[PDB]
Write a structure and sequence with these properties.
The structure is cut from a larger assembly and holds chains A (750 residues), B (69 residues), C (198 residues), D (159 residues) and E (345 residues). Chain A is α+β, with helices and mostly antiparallel strands. Helix content of chain A is 62%, strand content 8%. Chain C has one domain (6-191): Four Helix Bundle (Hemerythrin (Met), subunit A) (Up-down Bundle), CATH 1.20.120.610. The radius of gyration of chain C is 22 Å and the shape is flat. Chains in contact: A-B, A-C, A-D, A-E, C-D, C-E, D-E. Chains C and D meet through helix 3 and helix 5 of C and helix 3 and helix 4 of D. The PDB classes it as membrane protein.
Chain lengths: 750, 69, 198, 159, 345
């Protein structure tokens, strides 16, 4: 049974293949069909041109260049490439398929070369015919111009690109000064330059001059620019005769071009029906020969030594498949699999699924986890959606996003089958991400009592407004209870509502961020335990843990305790926790209001603990290394880490206030949109009122889905990513791992 | 069909929402007619929002039929 | 330059006005003390809170563009740096959060004073303290952000050049990122003995 | 005109309602202009990215939205006989949102231009640009928030 | 400071240019190229660099040293023109100023071909693409400078640099082309130095002043040494060719103008300590290229400077030459001088 590799990377095994040469080409093909072995470069010191399989790779590169020329021709002429072979090789299933024979690859190479020469000569002939046709057509257009064109040899007539006609006119004016008679008429249909196969707008230009030297100078000036000059006799009868001659020439050239293009298109259609298969087959052969290029060819023997990383659970499968290959070949060979014990950084492999793949990609974008290190995707599966939800907190927007994600999830098969754009592909891949974000946003908005900027009144409020009051009279409510779930709806639209919401959400963000950083730090502890780094536990984990606790965990505990204490009933002032924390450093031992008994002594002790832990974290590990020039590197790294950690506690606690910031802003923008868009509709009645309601709700929903669901939603999704990449993964994620990219065959699109 | 899909989605979202809003107005919910700045009459705003919801329902049914065909 | 000409004209006008008041026996008519005493401390406090947040944000944004523009250019060939040097962009955005924090803390002192106790010793002191503490925090965060962004751009380019370089330039950022912190601390010390307007 | 509520108190709040939109619309215009220049330079080669390199021009507009929100909240707290404290608070709330949005826009522009120019070459950079752009945008948010908090005090406990 | 306002427009430019720089071939890569036994091996080795699949469309039989040089140069010029397509304002003017030298070079190649009756197609193929202007092929019509300027070069950005080239005779020849090309590079370099001093901010103002002073010094030394071969030229005429922005100016440039022998040039360069051993021994061209590479390397130590676009173009241009040189030693099999590939990065 394959181990689950989501909590930690899959256990990796290095394996030597002593691949016999006579079956090497086949062996690689199986190792590429499994898609499980990540081969090491044993010839890393060998130059690219000095490697053993360089010539075969060069042959395959030439074949792929010829195929890339064939594709270019298939795109120049509007001929569709016949895609296929997606299910021919059963890619990703791990099942073996008989590879192309060496004779088949030789035939592919020879046919590619032969088609290269044939297509080169056919394209040359077609291009010559096309340029002749373009020249004749331009000459015909010049001849067909009205006599007024030749009214004002005695002149130079030609065709020149519009982007050059102004330059030509300016140059001719300068050459002839004021004696310029440059006429130009636009050619409606652009001409195709075969040299670039580019559509260029052109003008028929005529310049009148009498001097033979002046005429020659004008012709040279025009031809220096990409202009084609033509001879015209200026006589209507003679011009018509020349036009008829050009028409006859074009009639012959049209048939010649038709025949040549018919042959060329026949060849291209023959190629198109099989080009994809040839490309897929040659790219796989080039791929197996690059893999073998990483092997050490024992010249004295006839075996290639290939070192590859494979998941240990997959190891047995590998052997089985190799055995199958032998059973297919019928040859008797020595042990082709030999597990190896070497101190080489194994690749990081996390076994994911359609659910965990999105979050694993989210965490991998930052970096690849160290081998068998605590994976940040498993905790992000929940923590990235919920930190977003805190930043979002609305049942309406959350429900809209949940439905948007459900549209992708329920139709996941159909969307997977079709092609997707980059933005749509990203949205679909993170479809479960967005589903969780929407669900948790609904939950948080329920706790915030925020649905489309409005509040729900499910439960009896804990506040009772005065029995009677007059219109406009400032009334204050009295606490008769506590709202069971979520924020009490009593302070909806109240003057002081914002003061309570801000306090609550600041404290919520602080507590949640501290809990999420403590969880990450204990993940770091788990990493230390797994790698048996007791020195990291003693000199890195415990000191930093004490430093962060004594300050910010103490702040969190004080927040909770202050919430749990009835100050008004107890007759004690409500201490300011921010001023308590500030005085805990700037003025130790001076407490304006006593939160709890012996507060001053405890605060002094915690400050002393942090001030002792800073030296602890800074010195214990480097000194342990010294006592057992590298000690210099250890000391420098420890100093940097300690400064970073001490500053990061504060900068990370302050940063998680972005949860409150974005939640508050989302709520305020939602309420403001409600007031601007749909609240006005309630002010108008009748047909006007109904139309205003319809239009204003249309605008409100458009701005809610656009601004408050996608725009604000994207922002909150990306501030959740930083709280994970910078505040969560800064605590335990060493990173700098080797991504697992096993040698596998995949359809390669041209 | 994209226009029809967008319109029918925007119409269901608005049939449901305006029906709920009209029900809250008719029941004189505090969150909707509890403030002096809020509309003085609840049932009349409920009627207007109900008519708007009926317009959106007509749009929804028409665009759903268009999507069907 | 038009700006330099305007500066010189303003200086000359100020000098001439001061000399006219001084010579005519009315030098005391230009009374900065009366201006400070009679200007509402509310104006000073609110200007301090607005300039704190705004200048902290300005430095954060100024650094984010310097670091962000050099990360993007360097990531064309070395996209691996994009996430690695993003810590630089967090040192630029953290000064802003300091300013915001200070604004929150200083806004707690924006109470409403009574008419008679408006220009008192405590209220004038609270106005001056919250104006100058906001100025200090905002300008320190401005400098720290612009400086940390300039270091982050260098760090991104170095990381693209060689990965091992980044950790050595990040240290410089850690040196710069503290400069706003110090300002923050000093701000908290300025407005420390300031009280809500009463 | 009361001691606490002079006739010139509405001057500051009206200048704050204006400052919020004027400076969050300056920043948004700067960002939109530079991001659009980048988009026009890139989409000549890569039109397929156009309806996805529009993000910076969408974030700059969100800066303008943050100051249309602070402006509309500050304009409804404006009164003929509103206290000088309220006027100063409304000026500070518009100075904060407007300046923070200017900074955020100026940064959104410079960073969106760079990221659209680089994304036409390295698509993986699009994620980098959007992340650097969400931190330029948050600056403006932080201004709005301060502004919002300011307005939560502008009219309250005020005589 | 340099960093504050530099990245508002040139941050992406400097990042991309510095990424291009990181792709500059190192000494180890040059040695690996040296060991290549064939142009196919050279292509394979270059594929491992940031050159990558730049010859992937070239068949084995089509691999030639000229083709490799053309493709590497085209890659460099496409990178340059892209960077220009991302630049604006002062940087666009700076990058346009870099192209004006290639244009002066092309004007001389075009007019030199017109006076030798060589086909315009080959003459335009050999022309530097960066130095292209719309009317460059039209210089293949006239011989006298009067017609060429009054018809072509007045509208080009080279027009301001035609203020001392009219003195020569109407008839035009190779010596007159060299005189016109040196006058156009003197006026250009003085204009590009002024543009750097006034508009290009520091430390790209100092870096670009140093890199243009080196260019002017190299031009002056080469002009003097070429005039040495000629029977005699008026020292006043020589002074009209020597740029007036370099370290040599105004003393060493003067002494070079009145210099009439190799020892005269050596005496002139003795005073200046930056070019002591250039004429003492070795190859002068190699000495100049090594000094240019050292100056460009120094321009890369200074960030928030657009002097790095110039330092990347001249470094990369040396790289191409180096590759070409190596390619020659591989194509022609003369490997004795293969290691003279001037490497600084």
């Amino acid at each position: 049974e394959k181990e689950e590799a989501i909590f930690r990377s899959a256990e990796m095994a290095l394996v030597q293949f002593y691949i016999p040469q006579e079956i090497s080409r086949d062996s690689a093909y199986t190792l590429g069909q499994l898609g499980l072995v990540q081969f090491r470069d044993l010839n890393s010191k060998v130059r690219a041109f000095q490697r053993t399989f360089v010539n075969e790779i060069r042959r395959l590169d030439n074949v792929e260049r010829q195929y890339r020329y064939f594709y270019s021709l298939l795109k120049k002429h509007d001929i569709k490439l016949y895609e296929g072979d997606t299910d021919k090789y059963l890619d990703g299933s791990g099942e073996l398929y008989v590879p192309p024979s060496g004779s088949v690859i030789d035939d592919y190479v020879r046919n590619a070369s032969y088609l290269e020469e044939r297509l080169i000569q056919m394209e040359d002939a077609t291009d010559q015919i096309e340029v002749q046709k373009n020249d004749l057509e331009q000459y015909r257009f010049i001849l067909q111009s009205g006599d007024e064109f030749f009214l004002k040899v005695n002149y130079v007539t030609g065709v020149i690109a519009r982007d050059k006609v102004a330059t030509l006119e300016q140059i001719l004016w300068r050459v002839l000064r004021g004696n310029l008679f440059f006429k130009t008429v636009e050619i409606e249909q652009p001409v195709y330059d075969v040299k670039t196969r580019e559509y260029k707008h052109k003008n028929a230009f005529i310049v009148f001059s009498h001097g033979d030297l002046i005429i020659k100078r004008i012709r040279k000036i025009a031809e220096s620019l990409d202009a084609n000059l033509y001879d015209v006799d200026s006589s209507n009868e003679g011009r018509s005769q020349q036009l008829a001659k050009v028409n006859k020439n074009l009639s012959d050239l049209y048939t010649v071009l038709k025949t040549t293009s018919t042959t060329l298109e026949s060849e291209l259609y023959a190629i198109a029906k099989e080009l994809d298969s040839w490309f897929q087959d040659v790219t796989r052969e080039k791929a197996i020969f690059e893999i073998l290029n990483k092997s050490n060819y024992d010249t004295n023997r006839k075996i290639l030594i290939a070192e590859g990383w494979i998941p240990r659970d997959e190891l047995a499968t590998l052997q089985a498949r190799l055995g199958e290959m032998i059973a297919r070949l019928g040859i008797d060979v020595p042990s082709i699999i030999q597990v190896l014990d070497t101190n080489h950084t194994p690749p990081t492999f996390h076994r994911t699924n359609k659910f965990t793949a999105g979050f694993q990609s989210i965490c991998d974008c930052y970096g690849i986890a160290q081998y068998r290190e605590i994976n940040a995707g498993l905790p992000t599966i929940v923590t990235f959606p919920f930190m977003f939800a805190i930043m979002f907190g609305d049942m309406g927007h959350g429900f809209l996003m949940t439905l948007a994600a459900l549209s992708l999830v329920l139709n996941e098969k159909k969307i997977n089958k079709m092609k997707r754009g980059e933005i749509f592909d990203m949205a679909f891949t993170g479809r479960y991400i967005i589903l969780l974000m929407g669900v948790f946003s609904m939950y948080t908005g329920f706790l915030y009592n925020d649905i489309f900027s409005k509040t729900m009144t499910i439960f009896k409020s804990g506040w009772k407004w005065p029995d009677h009051w007059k219109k406009g009279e400032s009334i204050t409510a009295t606490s008769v209870g506590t709202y069971p779930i979520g924020l009490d709806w009593a302070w909806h639209g109240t003057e002081n509502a914002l003061l309570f919401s801000n306090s609550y959400k600041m404290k919520l963000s602080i507590l949640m961020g501290f809990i999420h950083m403590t969880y990450s730090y204990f993940f770091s502890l788990a990493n230390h335990l797994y790698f048996n780094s007791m020195i990291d536990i003693i000199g890195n984990f415990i000191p930093g843990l004490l430093f962060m606790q004594g300050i910010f965990g103490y702040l969190s505990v004080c927040i909770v305790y202050k919430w749990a204490v009835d100050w008004v009933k107890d007759g004690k002032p409500a201490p300011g926790l921010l001023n308590m924390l500030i005085n805990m450093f700037l003025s130790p031992g001076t407490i304006d209001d006593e939160l709890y008994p012996h507060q001053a002594k405890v605060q002094v002790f915690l400050l002393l603990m942090a001030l002792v832990c800073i030296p602890w974290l800074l010195l214990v590990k480097p000194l342990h290394f010294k006592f057992t020039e590298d000690f210099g590197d250890i000391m420098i790294h420890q100093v940097i880490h300690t400064i970073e950690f001490c500053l990061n506690c504060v900068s990370h606690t302050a940063s998680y206030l972005r949860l409150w910031a974005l939640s508050l802003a989302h709520a305020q923008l939602s309420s403001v949109l409600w007031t601007m868009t749909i609240q006005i509709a309630f002010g108008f009645r009748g047909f006007v009122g109904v139309f205003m309601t319809v239009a204003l709700f249309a605008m409100w929903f458009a701005l809610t889905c656009a601004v408050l669901v996608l725009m604000e939603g994207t922002s909150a999704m990306l501030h959740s990513l930083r709280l994970h990449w910078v505040e969560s993964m800064s605590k335990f994620f060493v990173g700098e791992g080797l991504p697992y990219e096993p040698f596998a065959f995949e359809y390669k699109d041209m | 069909t994209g226009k029809a899909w967008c319109c029918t989605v925007l119409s269901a979202f608005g049939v449901v929402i305006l029906s709920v809003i009209a029900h809250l107005f008719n029941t004189n919910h505090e969150s909707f007619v509890g403030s002096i700045n809020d509309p003085e009459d609840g049932p009349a705003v409920a009627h207007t929002v109900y008519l708007a919801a009926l317009v959106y329902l007509v749009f929804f049914v028409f665009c759903g039929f268009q999507v069907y065909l | 330059s038009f700006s330099h000409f305007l500066y010189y004209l303003v200086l000359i006008v100020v000098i001439v006005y001061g000399l006219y008041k001084l010579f005519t026996g009315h030098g005391s008519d230009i009374n900065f003390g009366k201006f400070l005493l009679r200007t509402s401390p509310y104006m000073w406090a609110n200007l301090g809170i607005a300039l704190c947040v705004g200048l902290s944000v300005v430095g954060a944004a100024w650094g984010i563009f310097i670091t962000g523009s050099s990360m993007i250019g360097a990531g064309v060939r070395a996209p691996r740096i994009t996430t690695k040097n993003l810590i630089s962009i967090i040192f630029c955005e953290v000064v802003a959060i300091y300013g915001l924090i200070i604004a929150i803390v200083f806004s707690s002192k924006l109470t409403v004073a009574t008419a008679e106790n408006m220009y008192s010793k405590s209220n004038l002191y609270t106005g001056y303290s919250l104006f100058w503490a906001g100025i200090t925090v905002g300008a320190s965060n401005l400098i720290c952000g612009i400086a940390v962004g300039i270091t982050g751009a260098t760090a991104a380019i170095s990381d693209a050049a060689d990965s091992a370089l980044f950790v050595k330039i990040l240290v410089i950022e850690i040196f710069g990122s503290i400069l706003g912190l110090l300002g923050l601390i000093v701000g908290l010390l300025m407005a420390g003995k300031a009280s809500e307007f009463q | 005109m009361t001691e606490l509520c002079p006739v010139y108190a509405p001057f500051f709040g009206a200048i704050g309602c204006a400052s919020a939109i004027i400076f969050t619309s300056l920043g948004a215009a700067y960002g939109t202009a530079k991001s659009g220049v980048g988009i026009c330079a890139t989409c000549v080669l890569r039109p397929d990215l156009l309806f996805k390199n529009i993000v910076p021009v969408i974030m700059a507009g969100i800066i303008a939205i943050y100051g249309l929100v602070v402006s509309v909240l500050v304009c409804y707290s404006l009164g003929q006989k509103q206290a000088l404290y309220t006027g100063f608070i409304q000026l500070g709330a518009g100075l904060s949102v407007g300046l923070s949005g200017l900074a955020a826009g100026f940064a959104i522009g410079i960073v969106g231009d760079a990221g659209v120019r680089g994304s036409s070459q390295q698509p993986r950079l699009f994620v980098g640009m959007i992340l650097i752009l969400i931190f330029a945008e948050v600056l403006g948010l932080y201004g709005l928030i301060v502004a919002l908090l300011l307005n939560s005090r502008a009219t309250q406990d005020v005589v | 400071m340099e960093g504050v306002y530099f990245n508002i427009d040139n941050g992406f430019i400097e990042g991309v240019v510095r990424g291009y720089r990181n792709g500059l071939l190192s000494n180890n890569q040059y040695i690996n190229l040296t060991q290549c036994d064939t142009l196919e091996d050279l292509k394979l080795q270059l594929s491992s660099t940031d050159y990558g699949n730049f010859l992937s469309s070239v068949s084995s039989e089509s691999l030639t040293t000229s083709l490799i040089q053309e493709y590497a140069s085209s890659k460099l010029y496409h990178e340059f023109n892209y960077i220009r397509d991302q630049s604006s304002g002062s940087t666009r003017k700076f990058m346009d100023y870099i192209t004006y030298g290639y244009m002066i070079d092309n004007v001389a190649l075009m007019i030199t071909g017109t006076i030798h009756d060589r086909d315009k197609g080959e003459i335009l193929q050999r022309c530097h693409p960066l130095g292209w202007f719309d009317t460059l092929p039209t210089l293949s019509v006239a011989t006298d400078l009067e017609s060429l300027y009054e018809t072509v070069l007045v509208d080009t950005p080279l027009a301001p640099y035609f203020k001392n080239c009219f003195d020569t005779a109407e008839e035009l020849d190779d010596m007159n082309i060299e005189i016109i090309r040196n006058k156009l590079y003197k006026a250009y370099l003085e204009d590009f130095y002024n543009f750097v001093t006034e508009e290009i901010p520091e430390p790209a103002k100092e870096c670009m002043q140093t890199l243009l002073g080196f260019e002017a010094d190299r031009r002056s030394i080469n002009i003097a040494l070429n005039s040495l071969q000629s029977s005699d030229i008026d020292p006043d005429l020589k002074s009209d060719l020597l740029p007036n922005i370099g370290k040599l100016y105004p003393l060493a440039t003067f002494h070079l103008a009145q210099a009439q022998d190799f020892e005269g040039v050596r005496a002139a360069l003795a005073n200046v300590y930056e070019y002591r051993g250039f004429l003492e021994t070795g190859n002068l061209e190699d000495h100049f290229y090594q000094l240019e590479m050292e100056l460009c390397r120094d321009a890369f130590t200074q960030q928030f400077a657009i002097s790095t676009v110039w330092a990347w173009m001249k470094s990369k241009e040396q790289e191409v030459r180096n590759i070409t040189w190596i390619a020659e030693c591989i194509a022609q099999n003369q490997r004795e001088r293969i290691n003279n590939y001037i490497s600084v990065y």
